[PDB]
């Protein structure tokens, strides 16, 4: 009644996890027992939530009232900013385990799922994902926000089709501002994702955002680091000088201007920043603390 | 529904194999644990075949299932080529459990059993096999390929007809160029099995074919160790000095001719090089890349 | 049905016993996890006796037998011979856990108890259990053999009565030559226990007997050690020279002719050497191989 | 060789914690099975934070680091901006773990020590930081930046003058328009600490600037959270009512101008934003709880509307 | 003094996988309790590949094998025929573990060391192993037979040019046969190996060289699947509808002709029937699925009726 | 300092077997345990044997003895009545560790061995040891008693000559008699032997003795059963049917007289009962299969009677 315990499972936990918040949260006495018990009864197919149980509920029940979902609040879907549309399969299927993978990243680039969507958010997903030279139509569209559903056993489509909608509706309010720039929803986008990915903790977006501006304005290619990890398919940490040759229109190294596409889904700030540059003379910038320098000269006598 | 997942268990397997194949197919999580629930609550009769499982299945519905039998196909008794009756004896008894090998062994030689598939299968299984000199008369009459039953509690009985039955079926290919060499079924298994035996990897059997019947016939010995091994009722590796004085008739160092009959069942390749032997004037050879000589001399100055 | 399998379960077995004759008889898989089983559901009630059981049995099915004690031949009281009450009463105690130590002696020396057997069995319970230098009344009326009991938790008295009829009924045989040569139960009986407990194992038990029956008519003192033992009550293996000076009418290093009464019962060869001794003119002997000296001196210069 | 996975244990974490951030982590396999190993060997004395694990690394050698608390020391020393003096103690000790944390802010407030910096740095710390009203005389001296040592037992002293110079020489490219504004360094850390803590990384830092001159021009107390939390020496993230009525100078609810002294340190922009603010006639500013972006309005009724 | 069992580890065994094995092989009693031996002292760096266990065999030793990834060294280099590179350099690695794959890969096709063969042995390996369209120059030219090497670090030159130095010594014979038909080496390695991997053991070889010799001077494509696996380089049993698509000089089934080369090493049987093939009219041939017995017929009618 | 327990692990004793005998001897506390132990540590070599184990020895101490098979060594060599000479093997392997079984069995049947016997002992070992239908030359010429050896590896001549020395002391006084009734040492140890076999405890041996010589005399065959289960090197309790029609001079139920030579050593019990049996009409005897009280009926209708 009163003696109730609000526990909270988030979508992808192990059993161990699962386990472990149990007594963390005083519901059971030895996490490794429960372990036991759902190994040993072979309930592994738990459903992520929030549950309201109490101490001493029998482990079956207890168990029971997890296998059928029966919560209080659903599970999470979360979708951090500055991921790829491969990162986001990954969080789908570990929320939604009867997915796989690959199935998953199919419907993503199917072209008539991608279709329903420049005809379902006409305003917001057009023509422009079609470009032969993208990788994959919908990246950068899949919003970075927490997602639930109420359905059983929901569809990549149902799945995707929200994240599509999120970024719909988070960006009504950027629309005439982008009417006054002549700038696409798809460029917007672009701008945003390369400002995502070199953005580090507390730098300023902005100034970023006037660097690549600047070098756009005076014809001088991005060269920016993460576009090529995004033509390499790979999140990794550094970027070799065999990278730098990578044949794709995605390395801004060897190709002027923006990429085909965004490489990854952006924040608040980042959008901000894409829209509202700063007003500067600065060409290049170096990460870590982010130094601004305005010159060929002055970045290259700033190693080490 | 389109969550099964189809898992195989070979006759014979132990509950690790079992427990282990279930955590391969990711039916449960753990094999451990498995083998932990099957001893607890004694549900050792586990019958082989092939199931449709699913995760998250209850554990005592997977091993009611299994211990019920209620699979997609049955369990396979492989017979492999080159298996002497008492291999073959160890291979039922580890496909039906509930019968004892000292009981197979008595069923395959049994005077009224053999009597049966003689008046059964008279055109493969004749008065040959009665011979006093032959240790067991099914020897090399249990054909080798993979056989399945629908019966509970099937009999040794039932088991073995289908192996006899099979050779019956198989050589009927070989039957008139049997008739063209007047050549008995008996002379003709006998052969196949001391090729099958001497037989390497991808050594030629047509070659080896012709050494035994080129030494029959110049009324040479056929000096074949496997038949040594064979009248010593052992499966062992080398054979010592002492083992070629064994007094047998199958001993081919001490008795001239092929032996009174089969020292194991023959594949189909044995079987086509002893009806269709190379023409050669070999008399020797040596097994490891397999050298035949044609002369006494060549042979001895070929050791190491 | 033709797929059983008898064990067999002694009378004051552990639960670790248990478990290992079944997996010894291959009714379980795993001795540990059967012990598992029964402390996991505290099912340690488990009745001996012979059970007909098969493989794959159900754990509790196996237990369940086993509590209700659905046996195919009851559990076995075996008393060896050689043996004193206290003896017995460990023995009564571990085939009838119900009872306890301290009550089985106190029945076996109740006054009640006692004359209620000098009644039943008068011809071999006789007055002579009263004498009030006896330590335990029936001590060496209860016989060596193997007795079973149909009723469930028989008391102490039902146990004890079966033991003194046994004597009875064994004892029928010498009972006319008790008559010849005027033998009371009780000496017999008396005699037999000590050629008992000096016995070895392939010794002559008619010479030790003569040893004793000579030294009583020459008024010497059997000076054996297995009475001083039995007066201080200890089954140990030596007996010190402190030991001998125990005072006890039973001391027979201080007390002439046989003690008060038996100081254990009886096999059927000590009962047969008391009745029919040897006749010889030793006087002392050693054991370990048992060599009878016939003088003083021999003996005295026969240690080491 | 070996690859290296970092592990975060938090203070306070059960034996089971800490298993399953290591199954997490896939530097063990099972969780159950090492909450075993610690229980039968009794290894119960586990320290929390950092620690660089080997997946395969044998049991015994992950619960002897642990127990002996053999955590990731730093190659280097960073100090970021919107850190007090507290913070700078943490990033000191798991730096130099042969320093105490307790001496170190003794150091730090030592009038002895304190006094030698205003002797050695005359331009930049002065008698100002001696003001009865501070709590830490040096809050908001310190520079972030990424310092290093050369020395093998530096003492606190060594390290923390070396962030006292660091502000020293970082500040002389501002000392042209603080003589020409009359400001002192101390109110010029001062104003910079409040914009730093109140500013999300891309906020316009100059407007914020703007709506503290404005009230203190106009006699409106700041009323800056920041302030109220650093008046608590408290590390939290919101303020409750009670702590807006906490005792204290620094408390920019319960008194007008600016506090006694910085609440902490500050970052070039902040300090950009102290000295070259926006010329508005904005008074109040409230930052999303969701996205970060603030919004600047005129008046009190426009400022309560955004609920 | 000891019973050795070899037990083999399949790569990507799971614990479970490698306990039930040992169980299996009677080197333990209880595949669950080693499982959880390997856990709990965290040995989960278990090598695939094969051992020599003793039963009995202190666990600690069997896992401690396995972790180092001691496996069972053979005491002679042995190549069979039907070769490729690729499997002699992992039975020279197995060998000489000292030496890498991905280095005895590049010696065997190091334009220098080639060279060197080609000076070495000018009878045998000829400019015609570096035809452009070929992918591994010595494909073919590495003799199937049993080798030993009395050095201590064996180079992968030194075992390679053994292989080549069997080949030029072991085709002697076949020279005059050679000469009279004007076959070069290289024609004669290539249309042996194809044979090679085309027939089961007891399979006529001499019939199915006829096969091919027929549709050469018919001009029909010679249609092998192992010359798309090796075009492929992939060492399956089935090929695939497209793979037989797959752009390469070797694939028999888009390229009239024999391939630029051989794509695998030889027995004597198949260099007999490159050499001395039968005379008949068969353009077709399959071996079953089952008894790998070689049905020829001369139509493709005869030849799909086989279905 | 420490108490001393006795254990016995049968031949083919399973570990659950082992663990169980070891909690039975309170010498462990828990047989599950100790499995596990076993199973974990992989030591699953344990020897059968007798061992002296003390409680609260460490587990590995006691796994330890068992795998190096530290059995208990007797002090001293006894050797009983009624033993054969492979019986008295085991009794001396025991007793002298560094001896084989097969090599003592040798050596009493070695042909120069017996021949130094027949020449050390000419009064005692003859030449009717060697006749060619006995078995093993000594059986029964090598006295029960207890033997201790001075020397360091005691060689299996030394030992058994000592046996043997002790027949020829111990029959020192049956001489005179001997000679009266011109009994050949060997007859007589024969006699001896099947009255040993026959006997339990308290039986009067000098009647059993009396019915074989009637039997003797009346030219019935002995019947002893003894002597067919010493045809068939066997030491079983119970002669089945087909053991009665072994082909053997041992087997008294084929053959008429005494065997060729004695069935085991004897005692001086069943020696004095050969010399001097008792002049009685009895040919029959059965000792209870429960009571091992012997009966003595003088006819064959008689003896059926008993069943
Ligand atoms: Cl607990
Ligand atoms: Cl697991
Ligand atoms: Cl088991
Ligand atoms: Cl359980
Ligand atoms: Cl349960
Ligand atoms: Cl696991
Ligand atoms: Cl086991
Ligand atoms: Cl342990
Ligand atoms: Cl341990
Ligand atoms: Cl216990």
Redesign the interface.
């Given at each position: 009644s009163k003696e109730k315990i609000t526990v909270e499972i988030p979508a992808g936990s192990?059993?161990?996890?699962i386990?472990?918040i149990l007594?963390?949260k005083k519901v059971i006495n030895?996490?490794?027992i429960f372990?036991?018990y759902?190994?040993?009864?072979?309930?592994?197919?738990l459903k992520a939530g929030n549950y309201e149980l109490s101490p001493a509920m029998n482990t079956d029940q207890i168990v029971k009232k997890m296998?059928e979902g029966k919560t209080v609040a659903p599970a999470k879907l979360v979708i951090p900013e500055g991921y790829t549309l491969d990162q986001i399969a990954d969080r789908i299927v570990a929320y939604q385990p009867?997915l796989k993978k690959a199935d998953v990243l199919k419907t993503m680039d199917d072209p008539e799922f991608v279709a329903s969507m420049i005809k379902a958010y006409p305003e917001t997903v057009t023509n422009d994902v079609l470009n032969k030279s993208i990788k994959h139509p919908l990246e950068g569209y899949l919003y970075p926000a927490t997602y639930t559903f109420k359905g059983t056993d929901v569809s990549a489509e149902q799945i995707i089709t929200e994240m599509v909608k999120a970024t719909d509706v988070n960006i009504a309010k950027y629309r005439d501002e982008l009417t006054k720039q002549k700038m696409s929803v798809h460029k917007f986008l672009t701008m945003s994702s390369i400002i995502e990915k070199e953005?580090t903790?507390?730098?300023?977006?902005?100034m970023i955002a006037s660097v690549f501006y600047n070098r756009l304005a005076k014809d001088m290619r991005l060269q920016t680091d993460p576009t090529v990890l995004y033509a390499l398919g790979e999140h990794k940490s550094k970027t070799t000088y065999k990278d730098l040759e990578v044949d794709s229109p995605y390395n801004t190294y060897k190709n002027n201007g923006l990429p085909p596409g965004p490489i990854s889904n952006s924040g608040?700030?980042s959008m901000?920043?894409a829209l509202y540059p700063e007003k500067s003379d600065y060409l290049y910038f170096l990460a870590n603390?982010v130094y601004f320098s305005k010159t060929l000269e002055e970045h290259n006598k700033l190693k080490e």
């Open positions: 192990s059993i161990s996890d386990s472990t007594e963390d030895n996490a490794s372990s036991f759902v190994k040993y009864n072979n309930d592994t197919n296998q009867k953005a903790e507390n730098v300023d977006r902005k608040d700030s901000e920043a603390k």
